Amino acid sequence: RPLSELVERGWAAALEPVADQVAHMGQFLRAEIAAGRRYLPAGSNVLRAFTFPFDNVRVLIVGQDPYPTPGHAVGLSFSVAPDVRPWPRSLANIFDEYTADLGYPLPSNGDLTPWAQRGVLLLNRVLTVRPSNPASHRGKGWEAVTECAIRALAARAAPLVAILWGRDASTLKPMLAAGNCVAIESPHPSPLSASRGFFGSRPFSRANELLVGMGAEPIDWRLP
Numbered sequence: 001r002p003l004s005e006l007v008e009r010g011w012a013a014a015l016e017p018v019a020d021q022v023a024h025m026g027q028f029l030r031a032e033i034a035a036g037r038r039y040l041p042a043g044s045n046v047l048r049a050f051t052f053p054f055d056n057v058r059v060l061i062v063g064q065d066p067y068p069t070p071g072h073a074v075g076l077s078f079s080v081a082p083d084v085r086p087w088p089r090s091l092a093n094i095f096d097e098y099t100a101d102l103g104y105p106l107p108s109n110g111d112l113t114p115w116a117q118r119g120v121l122l123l124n125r126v127l128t129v130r131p132s133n134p135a136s137h138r139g140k141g142w143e144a145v146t147e148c149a150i151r152a153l154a155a156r157a158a159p160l161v162a163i164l165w166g167r168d169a170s171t172l173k174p175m176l177a178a179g180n181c182v183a184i185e186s187p188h189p190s191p192l193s194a195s196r197g198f199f200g201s202r203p204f205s206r207a208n209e210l211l212v213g214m215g216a217e218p219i220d221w222r223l224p
């Protein structure tokens, strides 16, 4: 099916170069299901980050791959449905850095939709995973799709801050080598990496300063 039926029109146009590759991922996922290998998030959420406008992205957050526990991943990186408790460990760590950085109260729930509505792209390098099996779809073809997405954002030459969480930061910095783009990296907020440099990294305020430096508006990070 055309990308216009799956994602927002700006993103469908941006992802043109990889439309074949998306179709290929569709076929891969169907074959996974036929083989009894379920994946997460749900099909209809795989491309959810791309359903918010391409032209409005001011901050890109890039994680690794989706939550591996059924019931967590929703297609916006790090987000969960509002009724999910406990929060997954990465999100609880995100939220503690949020309060330390911004001084806002702990959020009421784990739903990051407000960020997505305000120009934050909640991306993962790999857009699917098998239950209970982190990184199990690494190297299966998403990387070309997400590379196109990152490079197409950069190519707009609009103010853009990328927050790179975890191992793929190095790989990714060159994709953001363009005017009006800044990439900032840290270790990932996951259980055993967060205390190796995610905590104390102050990404929210930093992104805002960098945006304002460039003449852009800051993100209102405040969650209900």
Ligand SMILES: O=c1cc[nH]c(=O)[nH]1
Pocket: 063, 064, 065, 066, 067, 076, 077, 078, 079, 090, 124
């Ligand atoms: O979306 C998610 C969830 C956990 N870890 C990630 O890297 N991204």
Ligand SMILES: [Cl-]
Pocket: 088, 089, 090, 091, 190, 191
């Ligand atoms: Cl986690």
